[PDB]
Design a protein around this ligand. Sequence first.
Ligand SMILES: [Mg+2]
Ligand SMILES: [Mg+2]
Ligand SMILES: [Mg+2]
Ligand SMILES: [Mg+2]
Ligand SMILES: [Mg+2]
Ligand SMILES: [Mg+2]
Ligand SMILES: [Mg+2]
Ligand SMILES: [Mg+2]
Ligand SMILES: [Mg+2]
Ligand SMILES: [Mg+2]
Ligand SMILES: [Mg+2]
Ligand SMILES: [Mg+2]
Ligand SMILES: [Mg+2]
Ligand SMILES: [Mg+2]
Ligand SMILES: [Mg+2]
Ligand SMILES: [Mg+2]
Ligand SMILES: [Mg+2]
Ligand SMILES: [Mg+2]
Ligand SMILES: [Mg+2]
Ligand SMILES: [Mg+2]
Ligand SMILES: [Mg+2]
Ligand SMILES: [Mg+2]
Ligand SMILES: [Mg+2]
Ligand SMILES: [Mg+2]
Ligand SMILES: [Mg+2]
Ligand SMILES: [Mg+2]
Ligand SMILES: [Mg+2]
Ligand SMILES: [Mg+2]
Ligand SMILES: [Mg+2]
Ligand SMILES: [Mg+2]
Ligand SMILES: [Mg+2]
Ligand SMILES: [Mg+2]
Ligand SMILES: [Mg+2]
Ligand SMILES: [Mg+2]
Lengths: 64, 95, 111, 110
Amino acid sequence: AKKDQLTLRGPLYGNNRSHSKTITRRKWNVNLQPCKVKTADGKTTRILVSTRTLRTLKKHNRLS
Amino acid sequence: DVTNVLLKPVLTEKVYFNQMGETKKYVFVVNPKASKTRVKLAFELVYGIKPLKVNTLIRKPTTIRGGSRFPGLSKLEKLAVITLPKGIAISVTGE
Amino acid sequence: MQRIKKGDKVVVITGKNKGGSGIVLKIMPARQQAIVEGLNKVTRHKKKDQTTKRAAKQSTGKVQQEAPIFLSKLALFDQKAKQQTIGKIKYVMDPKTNKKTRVFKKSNNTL
Amino acid sequence: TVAKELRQKSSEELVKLVIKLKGELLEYRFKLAHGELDKPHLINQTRRLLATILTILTERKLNWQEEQAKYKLLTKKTNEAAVNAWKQHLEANKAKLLKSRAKREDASKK
RNA sequence: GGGUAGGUGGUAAGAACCUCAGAUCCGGAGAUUUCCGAAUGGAGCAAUCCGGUAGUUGGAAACAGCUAUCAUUAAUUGAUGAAUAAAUAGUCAAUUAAAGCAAUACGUGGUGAAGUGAAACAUCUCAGUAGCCACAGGAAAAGAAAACGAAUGUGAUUCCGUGUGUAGUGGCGAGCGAAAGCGGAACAGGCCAAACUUAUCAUUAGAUAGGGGUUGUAGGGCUUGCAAUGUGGACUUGAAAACGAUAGAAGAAGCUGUUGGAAAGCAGCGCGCAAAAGGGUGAUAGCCCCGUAUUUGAAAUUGUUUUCAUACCUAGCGAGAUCCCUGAGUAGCUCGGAAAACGUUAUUUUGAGUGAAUCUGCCCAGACCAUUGGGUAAGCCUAAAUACUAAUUAGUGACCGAUA
RNA sequence: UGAGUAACGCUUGGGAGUGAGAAUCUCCCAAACCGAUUGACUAAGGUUUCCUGGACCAGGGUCGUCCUUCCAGGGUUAGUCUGGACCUAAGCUGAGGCUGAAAAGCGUAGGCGAUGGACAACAGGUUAAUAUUCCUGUACUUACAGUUAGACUGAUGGAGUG
Ligand SMILES: [Mg+2]
Ligand SMILES: [Mg+2]
Ligand SMILES: [Mg+2]
Ligand SMILES: [Mg+2]
Ligand SMILES: [Mg+2]
Ligand SMILES: [Mg+2]
Ligand SMILES: [Mg+2]
Ligand SMILES: [Mg+2]
Ligand SMILES: [Mg+2]
Ligand SMILES: [Mg+2]
Ligand SMILES: [Mg+2]
Ligand SMILES: [Mg+2]
Ligand SMILES: [Mg+2]
Ligand SMILES: [Mg+2]
Ligand SMILES: [Mg+2]
Ligand SMILES: [Mg+2]
Ligand SMILES: [Mg+2]
Ligand SMILES: [Mg+2]
Ligand SMILES: [Mg+2]
Ligand SMILES: [Mg+2]
Ligand SMILES: [Mg+2]
Ligand SMILES: [Mg+2]
Ligand SMILES: [Mg+2]
Ligand SMILES: [Mg+2]
Ligand SMILES: [Mg+2]
Ligand SMILES: [Mg+2]
Ligand SMILES: [Mg+2]
Ligand SMILES: [Mg+2]
Ligand SMILES: [Mg+2]
Ligand SMILES: [Mg+2]
Ligand SMILES: [Mg+2]
Ligand SMILES: [Mg+2]
Ligand SMILES: [Mg+2]
Ligand SMILES: [Mg+2]
């Protein structure tokens, strides 16, 4: 599914309000992007994570 | 082996027509899940004479007592036709 | 235990037959009935049926047998007492054999 | 009552009892199917005693077929007429076999 | 175990047996439990077909009986091992769990309409309802203040009444509608991270296993003393006792006459009651029978409570130092949505982006600033009151009595 | 009520018999239609409707002693036939895996899936009902063991044929 692999945070369903306040259901998807996380110098899996989790990994010196 | 695959012998016009004239043919009713080889083994372990060959019949269940207040179905029968060799004729009753 | 058993003398205290003394030949606990010989004589109109070795003759005319009677209408008959009377019974347990025995309440007679 | 008597019995004697009652049950059912069973209650009595013996035999972790498969006695009596009929039948079969090949062989030679 | 003198289930008579060495029957505990079905050796058109492996018995072998085992996924462990040296991916084996169903009922979460109303209709309502799906449990959810809120104030959560159809919110239209406070039901508060310290990992530890700590009238750590050996738990094993549940035992008291097929009706004379609830008995019986009030009883299984011991947790008030720790892609902010009564806004939440501080600190008191005051976010667990009845036992009805 | 009205959905005569009762049942003789079919063998489907005896509640568009109706008993025999234990086509399922708010969709290796391919039996007789199945006669095929003689055997893979 269109979801993170480190965390489980997924899409956010909401309303698409326009002028005249017309209601139409819409879905916000997470910014899934591919990244490779080294683990004990091995198993550099190409996991699909969000940019928020990517920033967390970057500030943690690639720790997960 | 357990010899629960020999339920009941049956005597009809067809059976008595075959059960005369040199080779005798004895018709029993057997366990519907039993095979021909099991039938031959049961006859060996309970009679003592090896059958020459065995034939099997499956009679399908059918409606009985139709129109009666409570109608009922029949019971599944497997018939086995043992044929002993020439000149031998054993009795189904008396051992 | 049971108020009425198979064998003891019994009489009827209600109905057309009053003071009918008899011996109980058989007790149906489920239907609360009791067959007493000589009492409740009914005469089924015996037909003729011939489909069996015994049915080939089955000689049956005006055979009078026994009809079952409700157990409530029955009452035990006293024998030990010199003047016999109809009464109710207890269920005392005597410690000599530790077995329950019926005893009348208008006298001291066992069974 | 009966369960106490069977408990007194050993295991091997119990398996002898079960096989004998199985045979007697088969005979009773066959006689009933031939209309020759005067006493029709012995079928039920045989089955109950069979069921009881199975219960006592299953209290201990022992089966009834395997235990009798380990040791047993063979059969007898039902041998003489069987071998006579079989010998006659195979002799006839070999005579037909011999005659057929000869007929074919002499036909091909000619 | 109870309990007897009958029993072999109903349409059901008869034939033949069983039963006083205690049958049938009732209760507790077990035994057996074919095939399909989550179905799970493989398949398949469900109740069928086709097998492998390891044993054992017959055969001279094929073979045939009789047993046990053989699905997938996840976790742990061990062995083996590619591209490619090492190492992983992968492969195999062993152990432990998961699958499914139902209670036409309650709970949580995700998704989520329309008929309809507004006398049309698009904002709105219907309604976060129906439906679809996931996960349970015997309840679930919630929960111990970065709170309410305007005071010499209350001090987890939940549920009921009121506050009130109030303040408010609404093409200010149809409509929607709290949070305080007050009166009640029940009541309980606990525990981690970091400091500091111990031991071990090529100790590059930034990791593992222990001691120490759990906060707001700030708490804890650092150093130095006094007083303590207790009280209480949401807590483990046992022992004993009590109250029950699953069969039962005992259980009082009436005759005569009359109509009548039949008395129990009616009449006369009586009797018992901690029993005058009810059912049957040839009409309408307190005293004919079964029962009921009342007194009792359990070999075996099981429930609640109490006592004793036993584990685990659980403990106060000072002094000095002025040093350290207190939960970060977090709180805020911007762009689109939503939750709250609110149609988005102080408070809560998040799809994208950005991004702080460290008790003279941070958040809150309906934009916002200053003063005053309140509280300690970014970690976890939490009984009770609350929701419901497919089922078991007892019972009730100004509920129905074969078109109900 | 319509109303004892419309309708009774393509096929004649006679003789003898049964029976309480006969245009309707049984037998016989004709007669009339089918005859690339109303004839015979089977697939699919139907599921006992098949054979014998009895009955005439109901059903049969009349009648009925009779029925494909009802009751009681009986009937379907395979190494060679039709299908599995052999193989694949369209297609289905599908461990891993990919995709997707959830349910799920797609899909690899494997596994199913005939309407096709490969595989050994023919003639006659017999019962009221079965017959390449039972019986008689004559055959064939595939496995296993022992034995005789000869030969080095050669697949989970390659190739040809199919
Ligand atoms: Mg709308
Ligand atoms: Mg066959
Ligand atoms: Mg007993
Ligand atoms: Mg609308
Ligand atoms: Mg409208
Ligand atoms: Mg309108
Ligand atoms: Mg909870
Ligand atoms: Mg009693
Ligand atoms: Mg009494
Ligand atoms: Mg009464
Ligand atoms: Mg704020
Ligand atoms: Mg809203
Ligand atoms: Mg402060
Ligand atoms: Mg203000
Ligand atoms: Mg804090
Ligand atoms: Mg009804
Ligand atoms: Mg009616
Ligand atoms: Mg009309
Ligand atoms: Mg008329
Ligand atoms: Mg007219
Ligand atoms: Mg006319
Ligand atoms: Mg006309
Ligand atoms: Mg016609
Ligand atoms: Mg005509
Ligand atoms: Mg013509
Ligand atoms: Mg034709
Ligand atoms: Mg029929
Ligand atoms: Mg016929
Ligand atoms: Mg007939
Ligand atoms: Mg007619
Ligand atoms: Mg043949
Ligand atoms: Mg296949
Ligand atoms: Mg085909
Ligand atoms: Mg035919």
